[PDB]
Ligand binder design. Structure first.
Ligand SMILES: [Zn+2]
Ligand SMILES: [Zn+2]
Ligand SMILES: [Zn+2]
Ligand SMILES: [Zn+2]
Length: 144
């Protein structure tokens, strides 16, 4: 037998959807925990804290995302760092003078945001921009 993890009842459909490892689902019960959408549409889905998510919602909630615009990154995107906070090369602006920061600029991360060594007045030296799966899991459609 196989008990659908979403609802607990037996799966009598022609195919059983398995989130790796060992999570068997009714196709209708495999929903994004936030947007409610069937995750059958995709090869993969994300699984944290016992909830199952689609990428958009995953990244938007748990993924690495940008400290300014609050939007996730593309696998080949190049990001500027601040101690703990990654940033879109386009969004690495001083929030006060609203202008770009470059490798070799004195700068500082304040609660309000990034500030250049002029609008600040701890201080740092802006660094070189850089390019770039733990909770991600494979969806397989097993025949019943
Ligand atoms: Zn079910
Ligand atoms: Zn979603
Ligand atoms: Zn950004
Ligand atoms: Zn500034």
């Amino acid at each position: 037998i196989s008990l659908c993890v979403g609802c607990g009842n037996q799966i009598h459909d022609q195919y059983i959807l398995r989130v790796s490892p060992d999570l068997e689902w009714h196709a209708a019960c495999l929903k994004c925990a936030e947007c409610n959408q069937y995750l059958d549409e995709s090869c993969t889905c994300f699984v944290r804290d016992g909830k199952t998510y689609c990428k958009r919602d995953y990244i938007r909630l748990y993924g690495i995302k940008c400290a300014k615009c609050s939007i996730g990154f593309s696998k080949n995107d190049f990001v500027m760092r601040a101690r703990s906070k990654v940033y879109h090369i386009e969004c690495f602006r001083c929030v006060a003078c609203s202008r770009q920061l470059i490798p070799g600029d004195e700068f500082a991360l304040r609660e309000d945001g990034l500030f250049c060594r002029a609008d600040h007045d701890d201080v740092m030296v802006v660094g070189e921009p850089t390019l770039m799966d733990e909770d991600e899991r494979l969806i397989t459609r097993l025949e019943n």
